[PDB]
Design a binder for this molecule. Structure first.
Ligand code: CL
Ligand code: NI
Ligand code: ZN
Ligand code: ZN
Lengths: 288, 288
């Protein structure tokens, strides 16, 4: 109920905004490109007084990720931390008023078609997000999962003041270690969970993301967990054992990853709440 | 006015907040140590979409700074830019509801006695600011100006994510190049204008700051100008010619200074609006 406009955007992100604003000007959906990004006051407040206590965090381990499927489990709204690994960690849960699973799935099919669409989601941070197999993405003979999974997206976007080039490979929840029986019993409507690698060495996973969406009568909740870095539990993913060295040889030490944890938390909060504010209207107008 | 809570504080600043929160716990003025920092929505929006047009900016030249003293001049609320120099530039104007000039002068004399007091002003960013002559601040044979001017303050505080150690030398407005007649005619109630240098290079001025306050029936306006960098017009200040080289040799290129210009704008907006939110209450209880 109490939303509040985000008030800070790094200098490079302000410049990106101006670039994106020029680019989207003559698009059919330009009216959806908006400068005010509102977030829940409660949620933003929770990430202004330091990292979470380690005891309340999760690792990418099988035990930890499956905690998300417990019937009595409901995620906190926000929070970030640095884990031994070293690894950045983010937890969140966003509400999408009036949004359905089908609309949310539509979004992931629709936006990659044009970079300018990707910029509606986060005007200040997003550059481009083309997938490798765009024909597969639009193939109606395939289920959502067959269209999206194993179809590397190459996201270029700022996280804080760092321009990143992330290769995002959406994956079946079960291949990520989520228990199928529990997942079914949790009645989850969809997943955009993925492995992520840096463009620098695309074959080395540096990240697991879990994103589970589930309808309520008044809309939809997205529960998300981000892990970016190195961790022994990541070894179940091919190439991941090389993460620690890759990270070190790039700039990613403990301090840099703790920073990234907070910046990811801000990014996640801004983009998903902003998407929630227009997605149902956008879908109605451009579902076509 | 439409005030809104500032939503972002850099990681190192969040950590400092906690240390500051613990240090202030047992102080009689602890109730004035507050996490929420509200700013004008109108002001903050003006610094979210890039730098100002150079045409609207000022240099620290004698001719330029005196424009601040023209009969019907009123500063815009906010704005930042990088000037040729290279030089970071910030303009602002803040309103202090129900605040008098005496209250504002008292703040400058009272807070430097204890670090904990300095933290009230900006809980997330301020570490300490002892001056060279602390006893001078309480000497009753001395005017506000006599207590402050030529009394070097060694401010340690975050600007953005950068911990800075700044030697602040408040000076008589005339000596910074402002016109006595214009000044008198403008009926300014006070100035906390200063030259600033880096603590590890105390004899090279890298900043001019102008801060002019004037009372009105409903409170007080504070007009502020920050210049941080190198510029030919700074040459009138002893040692200022060495700033270009000094900046080049430390971290400060064009990119760093343009960033610093935005982070200064944010810092200025937060601390001064926040001060405005409690100063009169603080004064009623602790003032003299
Ligand atoms: Cl493990
Ligand atoms: Ni495990
Ligand atoms: Zn994003
Ligand atoms: Zn300050």
């Amino acid at each position: 109920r109490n939303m509040t406009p985000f008030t800070y955007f790094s200098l490079p992100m302000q410049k990106l905004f101006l670039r994106n604003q020029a680019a989207v000007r003559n698009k059919p959906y330009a009216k959806y490109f908006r400068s005010e990004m509102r977030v829940p006051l409660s949620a933003v407040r929770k990430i202004q007084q330091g990292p979470m206590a380690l005891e309340d965090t999760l690792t990418p381990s099988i035990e930890d990720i499956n905690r998300l499927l417990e019937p009595d489990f409901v995620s906190e709204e926000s929070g970030y931390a640095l884990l031994p690994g070293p690894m950045a960690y983010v937890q969140s849960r966003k509400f999408f008023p009036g949004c359905t699973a089908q609309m949310f799935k539509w979004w992931f099919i629709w936006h990659p078609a044009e970079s300018e669409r990707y910029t509606l989601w986060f005007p200040y941070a997003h550059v481009s997000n083309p997938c490798v197999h765009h024909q597969r993405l639009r193939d109606e003979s395939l289920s959502f999962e067959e269209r999206l999974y194993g179809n590397t997206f190459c996201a270029s976007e700022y996280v804080g003041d760092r321009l990143m080039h992330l290769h995002i490979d959406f994956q079946q929840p079960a291949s990520l270690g989520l228990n199928t029986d529990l997942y079914r019993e949790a009645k989850i409507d969809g997943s955009v969970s993925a492995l992520m690698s840096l463009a620098d060495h695309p074959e080395v996973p540096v990240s697991l993301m879990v994103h589970l969406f589930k309808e309520v009568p008044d809309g939809m909740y997205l529960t998300s967990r981000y892990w970016v870095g190195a961790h022994p539990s990541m070894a179940r993913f091919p190439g991941a054992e090389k993460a620690a060295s890759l990270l070190k040889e790039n700039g990613f030490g403990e301090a840099e990853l703790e920073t990234l944890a907070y910046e990811f938390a801000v990014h996640d909060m801004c983009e998903f709440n902003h998407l929630a504010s227009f997605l149902p209207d956008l879908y109605r107008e451009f579902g076509t």
